[PDB]
């Protein structure tokens, strides 16, 4: 009946003076817009359909056209910014927020989905959705004693939409919207659905990707243990954002970092640091680097958890981007650690993999490494072990790489490189 219509038939039905004909054509439009396989979103836009779909959002009397049009508009809003912008420009936001109160769960879910596509576009539409008042009615949909009584696809959708209200950064969402949403987010984080968890962690990750005050808002909700637990999850879609969130938290203050340590995060890193997914390994190493940038007692926890050998292993063999985070983790460790922690690091075998990485055609990793070497030499000075270390660096072929790095055409490379050769070799 409504499969494979032309856009001009859809226009003809929508322009009829007949609510059923409009309904049928809207459903035809929706079935068209559901075939991706490149849905004809621009064709529908160019036909001038959007304002009509938006008006059908308000046909309370005709729940099915509300739904078809919601779905059509959802799918348009899923497109490019310009496509989402067409939907918004039609007045869809307030109309979708009204549909959130719909007694039809499939329609309010559709309105949720649409608003998630709109908010998903970026800061401006996110904040516009927020200004139109989406958050109360969104949150009210979750104001049930037990999230388990909600339909799964429904909950997943809310979670997803709410995560897009948490997302994007220039600017970050309004502080008061973040505060309004956080309690429901904390609750979704304890929900036993892997997708709701993935998206809750993503929302939390977006909220912690910011200045310390933003990190703090989240850390204060007491989420860090739950994040740490999610970090141990077997589902990579949960581990990925739990780790992003944890990682973001440790770029915060040493006190925020300590919350992650106290939550037991470091016990998961043997796994994460050897994780077969290179993204997790990279991000775990990055996370590591912002913990080794912390206090000596925090470096100590890294040591105590057995993590230095795992840093050495990542430094020895990892995807290059992970090796570069490991290099960072080591510089930070060496710049901030006690002499005994730094000696420890050397006893674990840091030197040969650090030296092997001086062979990398990447100028920032060389500077990070040379800088770690200097830090290590500085610790060796405090002990009169500069000779024992110089030999070590020389035996693994590290002197040859530092010597060859004076012929390097970079301001800090040849400067720190010549400084080391002249000072120790």
């Amino acid at each position: 009946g409504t499969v494979n219509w032309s856009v001009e038939d859809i226009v003809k039905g929508i322009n009829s003076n007949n609510l059923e004909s409009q309904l049928q054509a809207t459903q035809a439009a929706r079935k068209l817009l559901s075939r991706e396989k490149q849905p004809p979103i621009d064709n529908i836009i160019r036909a001038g359909l959007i304002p009509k779909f938006v008006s059908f959002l308000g046909k309370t009397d005709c729940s099915p056209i509300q739904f078809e049009s919601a779905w059509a508009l959802t799918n348009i809003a899923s497109g490019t910014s310009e496509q989402t912008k067409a939907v918004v420009d039609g007045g869809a936001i307030p109309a979708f927020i009204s549909l959130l109160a719909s007694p039809h769960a499939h329609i309010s879910e559709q309105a949720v989905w649409a608003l998630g596509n709109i908010a998903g576009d970026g800061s401006a539409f996110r904040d516009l959705v927020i200004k139109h008042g989406a958050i109360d009615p969104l949150l009210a949909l979750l104001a049930v004693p037990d999230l388990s009584t909600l339909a799964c696809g429904y909950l997943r959708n809310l979670t997803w939409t709410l995560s897009n209200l948490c997302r994007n950064k220039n600017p970050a969402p309004p502080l008061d919207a973040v505060e309004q949403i956080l309690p429901t987010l904390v609750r979704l984080l304890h929900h036993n659905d892997p997708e709701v968890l993935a998206d809750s962690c993503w929302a939390i990750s977006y909220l912690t990707d910011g200045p310390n005050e933003r990190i703090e808002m989240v850390v204060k909700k007491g989420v860090v243990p739950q994040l740490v637990k999610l970090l141990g999850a077997t589902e990579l879609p949960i581990v990925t954002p739990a780790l992003r969130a944890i990682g973001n938290i440790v770029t915060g203050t040493d006190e925020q970092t300590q919350k992650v340590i106290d939550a037991g995060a470091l016990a998961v890193f043997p796994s994460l640091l050897t994780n077969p997914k290179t993204n997790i390994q990279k991000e775990a190493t990055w996370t590591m680097s912002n913990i080794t940038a912390g206090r000596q007692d925090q470096i100590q926890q890294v040591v105590n958890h057995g993590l230095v050998p795992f840093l050495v292993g990542v430094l020895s063999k990892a995807d290059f981007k992970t090796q570069k985070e490991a290099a960072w983790a080591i510089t930070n460790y060496t710049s901030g650690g006690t002499v005994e922690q730094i000696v420890y690091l050397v006893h674990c075998g840091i030197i040969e993999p650090l030296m092997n990485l001086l062979s990398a055609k990447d100028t920032k990793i060389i500077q990070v490494i040379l800088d770690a070497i200097s830090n290590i030499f500085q610790a060796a000075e405090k002990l009169g072990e500069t000779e024992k270390l110089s030999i070590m660096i020389e035996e693994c072929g590290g002197l040859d790489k530092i010597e060859a790095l004076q012929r390097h055409e970079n301001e800090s490379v040849y400067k720190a490189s010549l400084n080391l050769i002249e000072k120790y070799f």
Partner: peptide, 12 residues
């Protein structure tokens, strides 16, 4: 970051 910003609905 991350998972998709926008989602096309293909099924009911």
């Amino acid at each position: 970051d991350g998972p998709t910003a926008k989602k096309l609905k293909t099924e009911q």
